[PDB]
């Protein structure tokens, strides 16, 4: 299995209005766990497009798993996966842990949100960092070193705050490197 | 060329471009370290779409260093009040201060070019552009960019590494004329 071989995608919110944002995009990859979070306007088809254009500038995955939500199920993006050789699974009564994990981070993901209703949007991009740059039991590193290479060039200087400097931002990463898993 | 990814990035718009499904500049970021680039359509080279791409960019990792000429979009306050906040160094072009410089002043003129020669269809074929730049070969640095982000001995997530796994007759197209002046 590669890294950006199969995408779990979902949506969060609606959350408190910061900036004109209400909703999250999230993208985890199944390989690394890493995971990309897009704030919206709306859970639309055309949202997911510009989203999904962005993440699909570093590569082109194989399957993207959804729910049967409207934005993934609308024609004009089967469409649009169709047009790149991307194959949609969806979420049904009947075909096959990994969900529980992702409705896990969905649900801290949110808790996060909601309690800084006007700053999550700006807070967002430490968000995604915080949770791709924390320790899994499972994975035996974190989801951000199993997709830029293990022993590879850290862009980071200081592993015990990520180079966070204000208070926000670090009882954010605290909470986040508890409550995670 | 700086340390390592991240610590620097050379930042700036290209267009106006012929307005592609409501598109008209691309924000054009590249890494230092590493010549990966990251291309953002926009509505306009404004302040509020730069701190919005850049949001999405700076998920991954802060940069220590944004460097960019003195367009409006990045002399504004609120940019500013952006970068302090983020704890990033802006560091503009000025009479003063004007090696790399030529890669990136040359590759913007092939984006326009590849751009523009696409009028409707440039800003869907943006992710090909972006995609091929960052896994093409570079004489500089023995590299391509992706490898030197994502890892040299780091399992390529493309099938057939000549093709990209790229289908189309226009994007094989766009891959063909990126391979030849990079
Ligand atoms: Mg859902
Ligand atoms: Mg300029």
């Keep these: 299995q590669k890294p950006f071989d199969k995408f779990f995608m979902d949506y969060i919110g609606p959350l408190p209005p910061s900036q004109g944002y209400l909703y999250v995009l999230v993208v985890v990859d199944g390989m690394t766990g890493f995971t990309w979070l897009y704030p919206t306007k709306a859970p639309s088809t055309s ?9 699909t500038s570093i590569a082109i995955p194989r399957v993207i798993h959804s729910d049967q939500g409207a934005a993934f199920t609308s024609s004009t993006f089967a469409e649009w996966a169709k047009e790149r050789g991307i194959h949609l699974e969806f979420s049904t009564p009947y075909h096959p842990k990994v969900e529980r994990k992702n409705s896990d981070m969905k ?4 808790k996060l949100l909601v309690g800084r209703p006007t700053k999550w949007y700006d807070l967002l991009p430490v968000v995604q960092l915080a949770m791709n740059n924390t320790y899994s039991p499972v994975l035996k590193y974190t ?5 830029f290479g293990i022993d590879s060039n850290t862009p980071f200087a200081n592993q015990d705050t990520l180079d966070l400097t204000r208070e926000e931002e670090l009882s954010l990463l605290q909470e986040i ?5």
Aim: glycine share 0%; hydrophobic share 45%.
């Design 177 to 181: 490197r508890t409550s995670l898993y």
């Design 47 to 55: 949202a997911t497009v510009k989203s999904l254009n962005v993440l």
């Design 143 to 147: 989801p951000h070193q199993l997709l």
């Design 107 to 110: 649900r801290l993901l949110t």
